[PDB]
Write a protein that binds this ligand. Structure first.
Ligand code: HF6
Ligand code: HF6
Ligand code: AX7
Lengths: 185, 188
């Protein structure tokens, strides 16, 4: 991930005019949408939190949690730390990243800072649901000038996605001012 | 560098009792002494700055600055970012690291934050001297509880080291209070 950290613009887009910032959301969304396709109901929820983080929940099968045979860590971790641009890029450029995977009756959690895992992916409880949730706080060492999520920028792109991913429900919620939308084609 | 960041303890030692913190200094010093040893006048200057960074200056030949054939960046950057424990470990666990290399008539400068280079190594100017200066600000996200350098721990070690390195002048300066020491042993 150091290659992403040293030239973030080359991976995510302009880091000063809001371009890169928004592309962080879109990259997570692309992954989430593909999760939703493969598991009944087929809905994602994109939230702009008051603290300027964005979360993206899917009702998919859950990113795989088992130990990757070659890397020695969970498969989810491999995905978050090893170089569509990939979610590893978002993680690398995030001051904090929270990951919650619901899979095979189990809740798994892991926290990252600037792409470094704080601990291994751990089972924290039981659940009847499946899905993946990623909340990230964009690093303010990378993202300058435009540092706040703009609702309409996210809305425009998600609208386009709904048409292209038919049957996938896309919800957008803004906790700063209560704005919400529901794209479903 | 991510392997270090992931488990800092395994590389630098204990990040909570001051051991690791001071080990950062010693690792740099070891490299500096190796540099000073290859030159003739042989001097190193260790300074504790008032912002709790430490700088180490040597009058060696300067860390090589040419682009590394396979890595695609200057040799200095390869040394600072590709993993005693290696200076790359110090860089990784430093919130800021300033690198100044005087070599082949030219001053070279680069800044790192948490091991990440802010720009490629750049020729900023000219010089008649040679040497390598590294100044680092320990990461307070890594180093907890003991976060300030204790002059006495540095002095004791630098005094011991001076006996093992004949001809090498080691100066210790604390800009917080003005304390200075000069350890120079001529043996051999
Ligand atoms: C298993 O396939 C993958 O790489 C999935 C990645 C992924 C899924 C959801 C998300 O919010 C971010 C990343
Ligand atoms: C080939 O040299 C190396 O690997 C490292 C050299 C070096 C590191 C720190 C310092 O203050 C001076 C020199
Ligand atoms: N890799 C890395 N980059 C960082 C930037 C700020 C704080 C901690 C960090 N760790």
């Amino acid at each position: 991930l150091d290659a992403v950290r040293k030239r973030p613009g080359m991976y995510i887009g302009d880091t000063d005019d809001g371009t890169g910032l928004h592309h962080m959301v879109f990259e997570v969304v692309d992954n989430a949408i593909d999760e939703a396709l493969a598991g009944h109901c087929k809905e994602i929820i994109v939230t702009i939190h008051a603290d300027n983080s964005v979360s993206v929940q899917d009702d998919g099968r859950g990113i795989p949690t088992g130990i990757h045979p070659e890397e020695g860590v969970s498969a989810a971790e491999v995905i978050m730390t090893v170089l569509g641009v990939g979610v590893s890029v978002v993680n690398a450029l995030s001051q904090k990243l929270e990951l919650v995977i619901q899979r095979e009756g189990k809740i798994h959690r892991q926290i990252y800072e600037h792409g470094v895992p704080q601990a291994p992916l751990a089972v924290t409880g039981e659940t009847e649901k499946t899905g993946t949730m990623v909340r990230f706080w964009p690093s303010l060492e990378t993202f300058t000038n435009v540092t706040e999520f703009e609702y309409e920028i996210l809305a425009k792109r998600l609208r386009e996605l709904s048409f292209l991913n038919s049957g996938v429900s896309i919800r957008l919620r803004d906790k700063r001012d209560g704005k919400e939308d529901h794209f479903h084609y």
